[PDB]
RNA sequence: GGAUAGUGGCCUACCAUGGUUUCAACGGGUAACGGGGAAUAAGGGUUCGAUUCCGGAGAGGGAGCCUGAGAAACGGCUACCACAUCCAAGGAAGGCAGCAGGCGCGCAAAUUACCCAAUCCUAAUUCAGGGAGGUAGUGACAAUAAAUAACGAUACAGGGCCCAUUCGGGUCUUGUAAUUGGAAUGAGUACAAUGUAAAUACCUUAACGAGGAACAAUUGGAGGGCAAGUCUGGUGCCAGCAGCCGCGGUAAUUCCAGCUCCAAUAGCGUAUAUUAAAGUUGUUGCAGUUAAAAAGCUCGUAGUUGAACUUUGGGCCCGGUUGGCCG
RNA sequence: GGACUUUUACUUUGAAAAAAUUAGAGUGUUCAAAGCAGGCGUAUUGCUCGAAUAUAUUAGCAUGGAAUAAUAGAAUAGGACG
RNA sequence: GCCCGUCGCUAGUACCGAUUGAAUGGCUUAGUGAGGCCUCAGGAUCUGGGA
């Protein structure tokens, strides 16, 4: 006797299992944004998919219909918010266009690399999952953080770890305990 | 770290209005620990088998030890 | 048709292929790093284009 | 317009005809006749566990020549006797009679496999332990 | 009239001959509790719903009833039927479809643990009780996030590019490398505080904690469908594979392995069921000369269906909501 | 308040309408599945936005419409108005 | 070349079938009929017609 704790799934598999061309095109995405799963691509293309459905569905009602204006604006502004949608094409026939890489371009993974600070999509991963870098003073260790435009300015290493100062940390602090122990006393 | 706090108008009104495990955590209340929650139930259940006081049923069994 | 055929030979060819043990090799990176290895194998530096392109050739 | 009444009130007829003709559908008919539950060696269920009566040597169908190694199993919930195939080289050495195997379908919806005539099932586990394991050597057959 | 809390064939007397049905009554089946809902995504549909909420029904099977505002109550009683325990053989006692736990059944499902701290319920009641309920254990049911690595130097090799009368390497890096280089981090271990009813975990965080011998990713597949070899060894229509087509009888692209290679990846195969594909159930939307399919023929009830025609045209006023050109 | 009214189908808007589910708004649970939170300062004595919306059909209700399709009317005048 | 049926082998499935065959479950005639409830009586005892 409780409230059903609700869930739902966040990805979708391709209809055809072995399409050599979709396969190449898929890996290349991972190679480019440092993913580990086709799922990480499956995930997004699914997000993308429904967004389009929302957008299609809205586009069949008449221009300046109440739901359309409310739900339309809401969709667009949220997309802009994370910097997927262009300021100009801010009217949802380009949310209808859109595509996967427009989404990929906003993962913390990708931002933490884009303005240097990593110099490799993979080094970008490792840094993020290893508690370095943050948004505010709030540390973020999830590569798919979807950097929300007005947070892009505040992506630095965190006040902890090295890099953002305040200790080298044990593996160096080990070697520094091997210099004044061997050579000194 | 975000948490919650209260502050009472006196210790008398704290000691009456607070949870009784909280007055424990601090020191202004003894944990008076008891028989296991299920040991206790069995106390109540064993007691149900007896009508009245009890000790009067000791002496009638103090005759049993003859026959 | 026939159902009470010989059984003597059950297990024949597995039990008579000479053993050869696996060879010890560099461990392959797991996760992301493998997808990376594939990307650079498949698409970055490429390899050959004899006629078109191959993936598990031996002696060609 | 051929056939189907196009009237606006002809719903009933149009419904009924469908009910009628669903019966010409193999699966629908099976579903409602409860063919699963009624005939069919398994309950209608996915697997069934039974006991080994005799090890058989079924000669394959042409154009293949072979001896196919099977087991007569007497299902436990049923007494129904069934002949099941024993996948992969050897493996028939893992069974023995009176042993307790666990049978499953052949993924052909009823209907026997390839060149094995009559066998509609395969062994999956003996003595509670899985053929596959025993084959690879990830596991050893129990005491008795 | 009686009975009921009360209407009523509810029951009884008297009287009558009615009630339902191809617009499917009545009977049979249901591996049937109904609903909110669930799964599948062009749409129309198809299939499912024991099961977190609502309703109903039950407490081994039937019936009976006491108490009471409320039960035809079962953690109430009475009887019979079926089970079944204790005994000094005279008798007495029992009802887990509550919580756990055992047997059985089977393809199939967890602890004989803690607490009333929360949620709330009950009583004479702030206090007691609450296997309601919360806490933990067992737990790859499902669902979410996503570690197994990251970066320089060097050894040639390039591909660049300026020059090329010709050595070439030198800058900008593409990277294959059997010596190298210091960095980073939690998996874990663990002072401590936090957490909690008390604990465990999580979040924090001192001390520890990564170089291949790990802290070492799997699960299927590599003839076609279908992404990946015509490598090497083995067998020789045997052993086996093969959803389907097909492979195997001595150079096996298919079996048994080695190497290498693919696909998905903390998950991947398999069996069964269902859904999409299926316009192969066809209202949308099927097919019937010869592929499956027009009753030998006409009549004909139900059923579906069913020609055209009856206030149209013109005139006047009122005030709205978008949009233009100005603001 | 009296006195009377041919029957229907269709369609429009609307009431009455559980929650979770679903669709969907707002909110950076570090992300996310979720959750219904939360956000601001004088962070020494409080300030404040929320907790929408939609779907919810077959039947019953309530209202607008009068095309399409039915029904009924006056022929032995037992017609209609006074 | 194709190809039809009897006849013969192995294996599997369903049918028919003496046994007025068997088993389970649901109703149900007739007979017997527990028990509580209602009711006519009863009156161990125990009071002021009642218990
Ligand atoms: Mg107690
Ligand atoms: Mg008491
Ligand atoms: Mg037929
Ligand atoms: Mg046999
Ligand atoms: Mg049984
Ligand atoms: Mg009457
Ligand atoms: Mg009659
Ligand atoms: Mg019918
Ligand atoms: Mg049932
Ligand atoms: Mg239900
Ligand atoms: Mg149902
Ligand atoms: Mg059931
Ligand atoms: Mg009941
Ligand atoms: Mg029972
Ligand atoms: Mg009976
Ligand atoms: Mg009862
Ligand atoms: Mg009970
Ligand atoms: Mg009860
Ligand atoms: Mg005795
Ligand atoms: Mg129980
Ligand atoms: Mg299970
Ligand atoms: Mg209490
Ligand atoms: Mg008191
Ligand atoms: Mg409990
Ligand atoms: Mg590992
Ligand atoms: Mg290591
Ligand atoms: Mg291929
Ligand atoms: Mg060879
Ligand atoms: Mg070979
Ligand atoms: Mg091979
Ligand atoms: Mg899959
Ligand atoms: Mg239609
Ligand atoms: Mg067809
Ligand atoms: Mg024909
Ligand atoms: Mg004809
Ligand atoms: Mg007409
Ligand atoms: Mg409506
Ligand atoms: Mg709502």
Whole-angstrom Cα distance, residue A158 to residue A86?
Answer: 30
Q: Is A125 on the interface with C (CB under 8 A)?
A: yes
Nearest CA-CA partner of A156 in A166, D79, B62: A166
Start-to-end CA distance of chain C, whole Å, equals 49
Burial status of residue A110 (CB atoms within 10 A of its CB: 0-12, 13-18, 19 or more):
buried
Residue with tokens 């050579």: A183
| 3-state DSSP percent of chain C in helix, strand and coil, to 5 | 25, 0, 70
Q: How far apart are CA D70 and CA D116, in angstroms?
A: 9
Q: Is the CB of C20 under 7 A from strand G?
A: no
**Sign of CA pseudo-dihedral A95, A98, A99, A104:** negative
Count structural domains, chain D. Answer: 1
Subunit contact A36:C31, Cβ cutoff 8 A: yes
Q: Subunits that touch chain D (at least 3 Cβ pairs < 8 angstroms)?
A: C
Q: Which structural domain, as residue segments, surrounds residue D47?
A: 1-144
- Specify the DSSP element, H or E, that contains A123: helix A121-129
Q: How was this structure determined?
A: X-ray
| Residue D111 Rama label (left phi>0; alpha psi -120 to 50; beta) | left
Using CA atoms, how far apart are residues B21 and B19, in angstroms rounded to an integer?
A: 6
Report the residue count for chain D. 144
Q: State the Cα–Cα distance between residues D131 and A170, nearest whole angstrom.
A: 50
Q: What is the dihedral of CA C9, C15, C18, C20, to 10 degrees?
A: 150
For residue A177, count CB atoms less than 10 angstroms from its CB and return exposed for 0-12, middle for 13-18, buried for 19 or more. exposed
Query: C33: part of which helix (H) or strand (E)?
Result: helix C32-39
CA–CA separation, A146 and A161 (whole Å): 23
Q: Return the DSSP state at A150.
A: T
CA angle centred on A105, ends A101 and A108, rounded to 5° = 140
Residue whose pair of structure tokens reads 């989404």 in the numeric block: A103
Q: Do D67 and C9 touch (CB under 8 A)?
A: yes
Protein residue at shortest CA distance from C1' of E105: D77
**Phi and psi torsions of D138, nearest 5°:** -65, -10
Compute the distance between CA of residue D76 and CA of residue D95 in angstroms, rounded to an integer: 17
Q: For residue D50, what are the β-bridge partners?
A: D75, D101
Helices (H), D3-123: 11-22, 26-32, 35-38
DSSP class of residue A119 equals S
Contact call for residues A82 and A147 (beta carbons, < 8 A): yes
- State the CB neighbour count (10 A cutoff) for residue A73: 13
Torsions phi, psi of D83, nearest 5?
-95, 120
Q: What is the Å distance from ligand 21's center to D50 Cα?
A: 21
């Amino acid at each position: 006797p409780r409230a059903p704790r609700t869930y739902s799934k966040t990805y979708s598999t391709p209809k055809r299992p072995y399409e050599s061309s979709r396969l190449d095109a898929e890996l290349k995405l991972a190679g480019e944004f440092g993913l580990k799963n086709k799922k990480e691509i499956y995930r997004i293309s699914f997000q993308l998919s429904k967004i389009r459905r929302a957008a299609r569905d809205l586009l069949t009602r008449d221009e300046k219909d109440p739901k359309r204006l409310f739900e339309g604006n809401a969709l667009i502004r949220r997309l802009v918010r994370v910097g997927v949608l262009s300021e100009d094409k801010k009217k949802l026939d380009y949310v209808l266009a859109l595509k996967v890489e427009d989404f990929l371009e906003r993962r913390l993974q990708t931002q933490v690399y884009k303005l240097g600070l990593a110099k490799s999509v993979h080094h970008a991963r490792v840094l993020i999952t290893q508690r370095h870098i943050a948004v505010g003073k709030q540390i973020v260790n999830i590569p798919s953080f979807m950097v929300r435009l007005d947070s892009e300015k505040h992506i630095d290493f965190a006040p902890t770890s090295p890099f953002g100062g305040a200790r080298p940390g044990r593996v160096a602090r080990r070697n520094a305990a091997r210099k004044a122990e061997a050579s000194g006393e | 770290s975000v948490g919650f706090g209260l502050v009472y108008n006196s210790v008398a009104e704290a000691k009456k209005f607070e949870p009784t495990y909280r007055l424990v955590r601090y020191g202004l209340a003894e944990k008076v620990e008891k028989a296991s929650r299920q040991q206790r139930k069995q106390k109540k259940n064993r007691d149900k088998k007896i009508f009245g006081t009890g000790k009067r049923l000791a002496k009638k069994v103090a005759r049993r030890n003859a026959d | 048709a026939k159902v009470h055929g010989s059984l003597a030979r059950a297990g024949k060819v597995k039990s008579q292929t000479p053993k050869v043990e696996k060879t010890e090799k560099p461990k392959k990176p797991k996760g992301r790093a493998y997808k990376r290895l594939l990307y650079t194998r498949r698409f970055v530096n490429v390899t050959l284009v004899n006629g078109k392109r191959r993936m598990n050739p031996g002696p060609s | 317009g051929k056939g189907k009444p196009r009237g606006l009130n002809s719903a009933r007829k149009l419904r009924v005809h469908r009910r009628n003709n669903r019966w010409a559908e193999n699966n629908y008919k099976k579903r409602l006749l409860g063919t699963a539950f009624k005939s069919s060696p398994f309950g209608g269920s996915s697997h069934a566990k039974g006991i080994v009566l005799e090890k058989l040597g079924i000669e394959s169908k042409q154009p293949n020549s072979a001896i196919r190694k099977c087991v007569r199993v007497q299902l436990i919930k049923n007494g129904k006797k069934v002949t099941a195939f024993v996948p992969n080289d050897g493996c028939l050495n893992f069974v023995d009679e009176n042993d307790e195997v666990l049978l499953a379908g052949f993924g052909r919806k009823g209907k026997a496999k390839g060149d094995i005539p009559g066998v509609r099932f395969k062994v999956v586990k003996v003595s509670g332990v899985s053929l596959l394991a025993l084959w690879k050597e990830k596991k050893e057959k129990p005491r008795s």
